[PDB]
């Protein structure tokens, strides 16, 4: 029958993506792919068999057009008139990692397994990360050809 | 300034331009100033 992982088959690898001059959605799609495990042949949609994904230089993410000023990240407090919006530039200068996070989190499944997958995502605005002990492999975002 | 969808010249000095995504009309005579809106 068709393969299912059993309790020790989920191997974790650490990848690291330099988000310098990389397109936001491009990076986020790639990272969600790795975090979910679509790049793996052991992929089982009921399993977080994905890989850890570090993102560095999140502040240097590339955003096309006027999205830096006319795309808003909205948020609601639950209270009336509690809609607070903040552009992507405002968000980049305040909380740089939040744009990359939000992008990936939206590209991920909105479920309990998605929540479990978020934990493998580490995002850092500089070029440096503390997860060097884990020996992360650099991951260039390629495009398979045809 | 006049703000109307139909902005057009009023005299020979009124020049038409596209400024910041808006069709403006400029002139020495500031009465003839117009903007699309």
């Amino acid at each position: 029958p068709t393969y299912t992982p059993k309790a020790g088959d989920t191997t974790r690898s650490w990848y690291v993506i330099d988000a310098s001059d990389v397109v936001l959605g491009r990076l986020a799609s790639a990272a969600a792919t790795l975090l979910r495990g679509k790049h793996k042949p052991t992929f089982t949609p009921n399993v977080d068999g994905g890989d850890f994904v570090i993102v560095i230089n999140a502040d240097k993410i590339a955003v096309s057009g006027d999205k830096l000023t006319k795309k808003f990240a909205y948020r609601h407090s639950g209270y009336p008139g509690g809609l607070r919006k903040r552009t992507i530039g405002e968000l980049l200068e305040k909380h740089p990692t939040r744009v990359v996070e939000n992008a990936i989190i939206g590209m991920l499944p909105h479920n309990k397994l998605g929540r479990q997958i978020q934990k493998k995502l580490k995002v850092y605005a500089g070029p440096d990360h503390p997860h060097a002990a884990q020996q992360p492999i650099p991951f260039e975002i390629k495009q398979v050809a045809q | 300034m006049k703000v109307n969808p139909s902005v057009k010249p009023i005299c020979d000095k009124c020049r038409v331009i596209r400024r910041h995504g808006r069709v403006m009309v400029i002139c020495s005579d500031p009465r003839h100033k117009q903007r699309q809106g």
Binding site: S77, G78, Y79, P80 | -
Partner: protein, 214 residues
């Protein structure tokens, strides 16, 4: 700078100024406070000074607290509290073991007093939110103090969060701003502060320099 101090509220009284105008003051036992820890950005991520106030027996102290006060290098106190500052240049003035008194302030200074409001218990919307009640006559069946409506109808279909309802009032941190100290009294170790102060008598307060008016 924003120099400050912890103290105890003792009660209100009167004084008279040079113009023979009356000043309702509150007497704050701005007492011997002792510095017990310096908060820094290289250690704690923010600049602040930890003060301690209130005599206490060394047996009523929880032993962790005893160890904290010891490693600081002072004897224990009852209440401990931090004063946030703006920069390392502002925190560089406070040394551990340093003693703060009312004399850090001066007559005519404007202060902000942080205290803990008196408890009004489970309060109705009238006492708590200034709701007009309803009529005491003209037919009112048992709504003389009731809030009345609570939301819209089906279109909302819910009660909005943050609606003003009955519940516990008081025991909340209250900062009263821009109170002019009428007088310092270092002999007694108190401040005569023009006007109301939050909390009961014997309540702890924090008299800080006014963040608006110097």
């Amino acid at each position: 700078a924003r120099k400050g101090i912890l103290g105890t509220k003792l009660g209100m009284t009167q004084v008279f100024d040079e113009n023979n105008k009356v000043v309702p003051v509150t007497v704050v036992k701005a007492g011997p406070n002792v510095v017990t820890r310096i908060r820094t950005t290289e250690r704690d991520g923010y600049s602040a000074v930890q003060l301690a106030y209130g005599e206490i027996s060394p047996r009523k102290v929880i032993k962790p607290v005893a160890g904290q006060f010891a490693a600081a290098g002072v004897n224990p106190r009852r209440h401990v509290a931090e004063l946030r500052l703006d920069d390392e240049a502002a925190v560089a003035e406070y040394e551990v073991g340093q003693e703060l008194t009312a004399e850090i302030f001066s007559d005519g200074a404007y202060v902000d007093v942080t205290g803990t409001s008196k408890g009004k218990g489970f309060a109705g919307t009238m006492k708590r939110h200034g709701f007009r009640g309803q009529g005491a006559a003209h037919g009112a069946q048992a709504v003389h103090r009731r809030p009345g409506s609570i939301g819209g109808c089906a279109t909302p279909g819910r009660v909005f969060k943050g609606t003003r309802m009955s519940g516990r009032m008081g025991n909340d941190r209250v900062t009263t701003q821009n109170l002019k100290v009428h007088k310092v009294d270092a002999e007694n170790g108190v401040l005569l502060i023009k006007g109301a102060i939050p909390g009961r008598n014997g309540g702890l307060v924090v008299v800080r320099s006014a963040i608006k008016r110097g």
